[PDB]
Write a protein that binds this ligand. Structure first.
Ligand SMILES: CCCCCc1nc(Cn2cnc3ccc(Cl)cc3c2=O)cs1
Ligand SMILES: CCCCCc1nc(Cn2cnc3ccc(Cl)cc3c2=O)cs1
Lengths: 203, 203
């Protein structure tokens, strides 16, 4: 039995590749969705017995676990098109720390440097659906994955703020935290190259 | 008079692009090399009167300054080809925390999460030249820029350890920390697009 954790931030394409590739070697394979804010929090509970975690969140070294880079995914800072910062000027990028941010909440109450909110006006949510509902209502701005907002951006229901910060959207390493045990086992090495080599063909 | 700080980690190609593009708008332009470990440390000294810093190092928010992404550069974990971890196995990646690392030193004694050493056996240096001299002598392993080790890798004087962690080498955002003042001035906006658009054509 293999237990795999996936961030809600991890595109559903990546999830399709991971899941497929594992069934070639593994007989029981349990997939588990988690807020990016609860990913590492979860694997560090020993009882939760997670073997692999695919998450965007970064923490240097963890008990029992090793890190590596599966690939890259995009993220945009999004607001209601009528949002004051809609012009997305270079002063507006500094003024994001002034305006209400709709940030992801941590069950642990604690955030990493990456996922910690930037502004003092913060309204926490559990998932990106809740985030974008509030952002569509112009209640604030938020940082969400590409696949979650591709739909709404073309439909014009949402606008981007991030282009002057990082043109093309904010590149984000998808990390693979694997139980130290698996490093020797070639079952995992197959999965890693295979998943990487497929995720590379998406890119 | 414009004062620009550049990391020793910033490729000399990037430096050629930055410097060129600035002279199109600016009449005095002072270029200043710094260890990645001393980049942010420097700009936060108010007397140093830095206007722009191009560095790989990351710190969320700084007094007087705004952040943005100029582009991406590569970095490899390198050792003497005869180094015990030469096989670069997945257990060897975990065992880097056991072996002597030749890390960059901070004049402030403090490191960011990014540039803080990983192993307990650490031998600090001021620059990548010192790092790679010691690494060629097999004294330890180190993390250095692509352009610094491209020469030695082909010549076989050095070996790579990083490929299982991140195939292709370790992607690293080149940040542009600019004095908040410049956000309005179109002189800077020209430079940013121009530098990005040229650094993109290198990629
Ligand atoms: C100028 C506005 C951008 C600064 C603020 C940033 N935030 C980050 C970290 N961050 C956070 N939330 C995410 C959610 C989803 C995804 Cl896919 C990525 C991320 C992410 O990178 C970087 S850059
Ligand atoms: C498995 C070995 C890799 C883990 C250890 C890492 N270290 C980092 C931060 N880091 C540090 N030193 C640099 C020097 C030069 C350049 Cl161009 C980049 C960097 C860098 O990213 C990431 S990954």
């Amino acid at each position: 039995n293999l237990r795999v954790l996936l961030d809600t931030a991890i595109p559903p394409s990546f999830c399709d590749t991971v899941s497929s590739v594992l069934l070639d070697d593994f007989n029981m394979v349990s997939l588990i969705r988690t807020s990016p804010a609860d990913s590492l929090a979860t694997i560090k509970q020993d009882n939760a017995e997670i073997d692999i975690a695919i998450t965007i969140d970064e923490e240097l070294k963890i008990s029992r676990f090793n890190q590596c880079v599966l690939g890259y995914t995009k993220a945009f800072v999004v607001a209601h098109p009528q949002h004051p910062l809609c012009n997305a000027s270079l002063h507006s990028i500094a003024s994001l720390a002034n305006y209400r941010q709709i940030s992801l909440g941590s069950r642990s109450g604690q955030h990493s440097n990456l996922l910690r909110p930037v502004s003092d006006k913060v309204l926490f949510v559990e998932n990106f659906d809740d985030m974008l509902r509030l952002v569509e209502a112009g209640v604030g701005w938020g940082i969400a994955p590409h696949y979650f907002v591709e739909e709404r951006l073309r439909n014009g229901t949402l606008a981007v703020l991030s282009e002057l910060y990082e043109p093309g959207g904010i590149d984000t390493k998808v990390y693979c935290y694997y139980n130290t045990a698996l490093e020797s086992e070639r079952s995992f090495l197959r999965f890693l190259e295979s998943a990487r080599q497929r995720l590379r063909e998406l890119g």
